[PDB]
Structures are given as structure tokens and as C-alpha cells.
Amino acid sequence: MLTAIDYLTKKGWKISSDPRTYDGYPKNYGYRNYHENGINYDEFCGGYHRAFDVYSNETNDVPAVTSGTVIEANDYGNFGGTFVIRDANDNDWIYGHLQRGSMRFVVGDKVNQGDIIGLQGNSNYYDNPMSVHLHLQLRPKDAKKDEKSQVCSGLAMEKYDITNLNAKQ
């Protein structure tokens, strides 16, 4: 089985936040409660971070980890510069904190796995201090449309096979 994480670490990306390391795992998935220096980073999600933060020193091109359709390409989304791909399973890959104005696609575009979709960055809603990284989250198909479920819902990416989600578009 190949995960989006396996895909990224083979290309030299490294993991800054890994829900398999949070206390209680596999229980209480994504419970992170990351706060420092007066910023509570998981405040909006009641401390939950159902997602992987990864980063690269080598380059800043962010590759699409699966193929699919662009459904959100927002410079000022909830994760700063927010880019979302819906894959063949109709789950939504959230790419967050991209350099605003770096997105290479618009809503409706088709994307092949590995296509460069934007640049790694540190943009966020309130424009607070943040380290340059990619936030990658797999929002499920059955995510409620209410805002907290569009931002905080998340599948366990480490259990999600992408071996067959790379079809040519």
C-alpha cells in the first residue's frame, strides 16, 4: 500500500507533525493541541489536527499527491492559501498554507498526480507567525457542509491507499 505520506517522503519531503505520534493513538485521532507563544494553532478544531504537516528544504514546488479535480483554489481560505483536489474516491485533499498567488490551477481544472500545484509557504488566515510547511489533510466525502466539519474533518491518511488514484486526466 502507498500513502500520500509515503509518496511525499520518497520525494524528500519530511514530516513536521504526524498524528501517529499524538498521545492516545490510534484513539482520539488527530488530537494535537499545538499552542506556543500565545497562539493556539488548533483552536478552531477544538485541538484536533486530522492531517499531516510536512516540509521540504530541497524545493518549494508542491506536487499533487493524487489525480483529480480542483474544487477550491483560494488565496484567503481557512488554511491561508488553500488548494483542494477531489480524487477518484470523491475525498478532498486539502493543501494549506501555500504562498498566496502561487497556485497553478483554477477550480474545475484536472490535475495529474505529481503536477506542481503551488509553492510551500506559511500563509494562514490571521497571518500569524508560522513556520514554512505544507499542511495536507484528507477531508472525507461524508464531511458535513457546516464550516467546522469542512475544516476539521479528516480521514487517517496513513491508512489511505493512493496506488490507484493516479489516473491520467
Tell me the binding residues for Zn(2+): 49, 53, 135
Only one of the segments 25-33, 112-120, 129-137, 158-166 lies at the binding site for Zn ion (rule: CB under 5 A); that segment is 129-137
Residues 6+ apart with CB under 8 A from 138: 4, 51, 91, 92, 93, 94, 154, 155, 157, 160
7 vs 52, beta carbon nearer Zn ion: 52
Q: Applying CB under 5 A, does 53 fall inside the site for Zn ion?
A: yes
Only one of the segments 29-37, 70-78, 86-94, 131-139 lies at the binding site for Zn ion (rule: CB under 5 A); that segment is 131-139
Q: Applying CB under 5 A, does 72 fall inside the site for Zn ion?
A: no
56 vs 112, beta carbon nearer Zn ion: 56
The Cα 154–Cα 48 span in angstroms is 10
79 vs 105, beta carbon nearer Zn ion: 79
Three cell numbers, residue 26: 490510534
Q: Applying CB under 5 A, does 135 fall inside the site for Zn ion?
A: yes
- CA atoms within a 13 Å half-sphere pointing along the CA-CB vector of 88: 15
Q: Give the distance, in angstroms, between the CA of residue 102 and the centroid of all CA atoms in the same chain.
A: 16
Interaction pattern, residues 2-41, with Zn ion; x per rule: CB under 5 A: ----------------------------------------
H-helix or E-strand spanning residue 26: none
Candidates 132, 130, 135, 112; CA nearest to 5 is: 135
Positions touching Zn ion (CB under 5 A) are 51, 53, 135
